[PDB]
Amino acid sequence: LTRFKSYTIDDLRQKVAQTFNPKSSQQLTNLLDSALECVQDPNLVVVY
Amino acid sequence: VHGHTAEAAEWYVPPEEYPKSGGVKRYLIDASMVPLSIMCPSYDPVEYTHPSVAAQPVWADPADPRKIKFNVKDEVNGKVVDRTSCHPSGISIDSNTGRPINPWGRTGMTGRGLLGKWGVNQAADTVVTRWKRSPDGSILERDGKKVLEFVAIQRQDNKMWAIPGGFVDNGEDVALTSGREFMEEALGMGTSAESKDSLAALFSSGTIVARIYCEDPRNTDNAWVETTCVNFHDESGRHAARLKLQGGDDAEHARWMMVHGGLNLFASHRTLLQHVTSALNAYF
Amino acid sequence: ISFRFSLDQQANRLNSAVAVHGHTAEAAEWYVPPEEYPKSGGVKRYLIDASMVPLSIMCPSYDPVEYT
Ligand SMILES: Nc1ncnc2c1ncn2[C@@H]1O[C@H](COP(=O)(O)OP(=O)(O)OC[C@H]2O[C@@H](O)[C@H](O)[C@@H]2O)[C@@H](O)[C@H]1O
Ligand SMILES: [Mg+2]
Ligand SMILES: [Mg+2]
Ligand SMILES: [Mg+2]
């Protein structure tokens, strides 16, 4: 869709560092890689 | 705004535990002592070779580095090898033992290790790309640029994702090497008569993206991997839709993935993704 | 959908088909005519292979017929 075309890596990284506060680069990297690893199959995630 | 913040001088430092070495630890060094342009008088690296490389297989060089001509194409067992680097200064050889020295900086470990060949391990990488399209058919666009999908395999060594590619065979060119690595690792052929013809029509157009030193953990001071990246772009997407991905040989699972700036891959493959999104003018 | 697809379509080379097909040559497809000449009443010309077609190849056993 048109509204999601401004979605970026860095606002998602600021969202993960907003809600989790990992206090490390590697833990934020592992949580961002886990959150991008969950959404890799498009059939398996249904967003309501 | 930030202050005295340096965006540069981020040299690659390998981890001190070597992979699959059984707890063998290399010499821990700082990032300023990584390149050989810096002095580092207290740098005492260890010398380690793997016991699979010490049993002398068919894909490995012998254990004496004497009478081996580097920076030129050499004939080993009647087979052509490249044996040259992409460095501008070139590969240097230590005259005390005959072993070469890596021009891209010291890694804190000597010998060959898990790498079979002395000097430059020449690798070829296969990046097969298609456009990320909708179910309606429109190409997906993020941040004012188009969005690419690429085939990624999962390695059996480190249990994490990488691009398809591998080391060069003796007596073979890079177009045979990248095609055999994409057939064995990504496609799983070996270990169709129309899908193979569509795969040959996909493989008929291949452009060289980059030729860069790998940031691998397996690189020692006398053995280092330099690779060449071949891109196979399907602009129509009809050839990429007929490829059935199945993991084989040195790969566990192979699937399509979306390229982005926060990718977590093996070694320096994000630089190759930045080069192929610079070449095909896509999102990064 | 046609306007969106039209704006989507408006927007060191190497060949690696050796490793998939094998020893397959895309070139050397020289034209060979059929041995029956058209409207000749059953007159047959000399049958030759595709490698003996050009005159850069030698072909010592090539004995063509002469027909007007
Ligand atoms: N020069 C070599 N060095 C080490 N191992 C080798 C070599 N040549 C053959 N081998 C053996 O063959 C296998 C290598 O598989 P490849 O597909 O050739 O390479 P792979 O390790 O799967 O991929 C390496 C890829 O990672 C990147 O660093 C680099 O770009 C390269 O393309 C290993 O099991 C190893 O035992
Ligand atoms: Mg291999
Ligand atoms: Mg492999
Ligand atoms: Mg392999």
Side-chain angles (χ1 to χ4, degrees), chain B residues 54-55 57 59-63 65 70:
Chain B
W59 44 267
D61 281 344
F70 295 99

Side-chain angles (χ1 to χ4, degrees), chain B residues 175 203 206 208 230 232, chain C residues 4 14-16 19-20:
Chain B
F203 273 13
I208 293 178
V230 194
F232 294 103
Chain C
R4 169 88 268 155
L14 62 80
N15 201 322
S16 76
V20 162

Side-chain angles (χ1 to χ4, degrees), chain B residues 153 155 164-167 248 251:
Chain B
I153 61 170
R155 303 182 52 88
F167 303 98

Side-chain angles (χ1 to χ4, degrees), chain B residues 245 247-248 251 253-262 264-273 275-282:
Chain B
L245 291 198
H253 190 32
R255 66 182 180 191
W256 288 95
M257 275 174 138
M258 186 198 73
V259 63
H260 51 78
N264 199 40
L265 302 184
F266 168 68
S268 55
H269 289 171
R270 189 142 78 168
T271 310
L272 294 183
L273 292 175
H275 283 143
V276 75
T277 51
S278 282
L280 292 161
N281 205 65

Side-chain angles (χ1 to χ4, degrees), chain B residues 138-139 175 179 199-200 203 206-208 230 232, chain C residues 1 4-5 7 11 14-20:
Chain B
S138 50
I139 305 169
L199 181 67
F203 273 13
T207 61
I208 293 178
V230 194
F232 294 103
Chain C
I1 287 171
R4 169 88 268 155
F5 187 72
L7 293 171
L14 62 80
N15 201 322
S16 76
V18 183
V20 162

